[PDB]
């Protein structure tokens, strides 16, 4: 009967880069939904398969919260069945995902003066990700015939590149963190409540 | 990804040292630097990070008053600088990044050790 | 500041099941990450996320963390896992992270 560390997850002080993605794994505790979304906090609040406040009302087996940072022009690819780069490489989401999806802007937070580049996406890779692959790879991506072997040049780059979030950049390419909940199932028995 | 570190040291108490930590392979002022310290017949014990944007180091409790973490982007290098050594600083020192609190203390370097006798 | 309570050995016999313990308070609302340090070397990253394998690790190696105690659990123990393991949690409002005391699992070979 002891509440969930929610607060842990919304509320830390540094997030990820998108191409590595959080998975807090909640397990064993009480979770008072409704004080989360009527938090009115979030410009993205958007749920898929269940409804937001019939969520307190409920139980699941695992809960897990993934959480990163985007820009805000690709929140809308946090969603099943989406394109973009951030849905094809770095996190993509199930055509049957059955969770949350909450952000919102973070531009007092994540974003300096000179330039804050420590926030990272994959720009480059082979094939889209299946639904919550995580990719740390750095390997040198290859786009000739002719192999890198580590060196960059032409036909062979770094996989990664850096969001440049500025306080004086627009709404769309400013940071949003994400917070990602994703519900499964019983046959097992179940931990997570309200 | 590599970080590189200075080699062993030899002080008397009361003197002072400071160890570097050259990195390569990506950009220094990026991620964070962090140090830990192990002393003989004990465990890893975190020390503190300095942030390699803005120079911001954090103390853990217990590691202030002496230590001073100091950096040279010049030369993608970090550096420990320790004053008035204890006998209880005899110690192995590593230089450890964390990419984030993810990958935490994921590459470090081959460790720098220091013996403080009289 | 935080405290972290692991056991100083723990002994196994050749190809079984290893768990060590790593004591907190309700530590399961944390995110608990484990070290591999051979004597002589520096310290590398077998587990982070509570359960999460890093590229390269042998699947032999899955975690766990819930309640207030983590467990790291070695699948298949082979002579060479003799180590010094550690656990360490990063506090999310302190950003201090917290090391263990350490644990040197002895394979009974």
């Known amino acids: 009967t002891n509440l969930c560390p929610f607060g842990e997850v919304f509320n830390a002080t540094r997030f990820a880069s998108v191409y590595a993605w959080n998975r807090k794994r909640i397990s064993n505790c009480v979770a008072d939904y409704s004080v989360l979304y009527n938090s009115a906090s979030f410009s993205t609040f958007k749920c898929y398969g269940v409804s937001p406040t019939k969520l307190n009302d409920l139980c699941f087996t695992n809960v897990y919260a993934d959480s990163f940072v985007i820009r805000g022009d690709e929140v809308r690819q946090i969603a099943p069945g989406q394109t973009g780069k951030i849905a094809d490489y770095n996190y993509k989401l199930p055509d049957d995902f059955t969770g949350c999806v909450i952000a919102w802007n973070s531009n007092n937070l994540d974003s300096k003066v000179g330039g804050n580049y420590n926030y990272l996406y994959r720009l480059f890779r082979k094939s889209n990700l299946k639904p919550f692959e995580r990719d740390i790879s750095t390997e040198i991506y290859q786009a000739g015939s002719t192999p890198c072997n580590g060196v960059e040049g032409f036909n062979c780059y770094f996989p990664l590149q850096s969001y440049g979030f500025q306080p004086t950049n627009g709404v769309g390419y400013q940071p949003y963190r994400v917070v990602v909940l994703s519900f499964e199932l019983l046959h097992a028995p179940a931990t997570v409540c309200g | 990804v590599q970080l590189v570190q200075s080699g062993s040291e030899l002080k008397k108490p009361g003197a002072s040292v400071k160890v570097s930590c050259k990195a390569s392979?990506?950009?220094?002022?990026?991620?964070?630097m962090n140090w830990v310290r192990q002393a003989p017949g004990q465990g890893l014990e975190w020390m503190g990070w300095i942030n390699t944007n803005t120079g911001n180091p954090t103390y853990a409790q217990g590691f202030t008053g002496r230590f001073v973490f100091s950096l040279d982007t010049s030369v993608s290098t970090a550096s420990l600088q320790i004053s008035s050594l204890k006998a209880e600083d005899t110690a192995v020192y590593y230089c450890?990044?964390?990419?984030?609190?993810?990958?935490?203390?994921?590459?470090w370097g081959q460790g720098t050790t220091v013996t403080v006798s009289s | 500041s935080y405290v972290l309570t692991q056991p100083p050995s723990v002994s196994v016999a050749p190809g079984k099941t290893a768990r060590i313990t790593c004591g907190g308070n309700?530590?399961?609302?944390?995110?608990v990450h484990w070290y591999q340090q051979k004597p002589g070397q520096a310290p590398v990253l077998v587990i982070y996320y509570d359960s999460d394998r890093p590229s390269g690790i042998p699947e032999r190696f899955s975690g766990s963390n819930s309640g207030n105690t983590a467990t790291l659990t070695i699948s298949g123990v082979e002579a060479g896992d003799e180590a010094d393991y550690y656990c360490?949690?990063?506090?999310?409002?302190?950003?201090?992270?917290?090391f263990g005391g350490g644990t040197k699992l002895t394979v009974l070979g």
């Open positions: 360490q949690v990063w506090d999310s409002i302190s950003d201090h992270r917290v």
């Open positions: 450890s990044c964390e990419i984030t609190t993810l990958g935490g203390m994921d590459v």
């Open positions: 392979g990506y950009t220094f002022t990026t991620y964070v």
């Open positions: 309700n530590i399961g609302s944390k995110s």
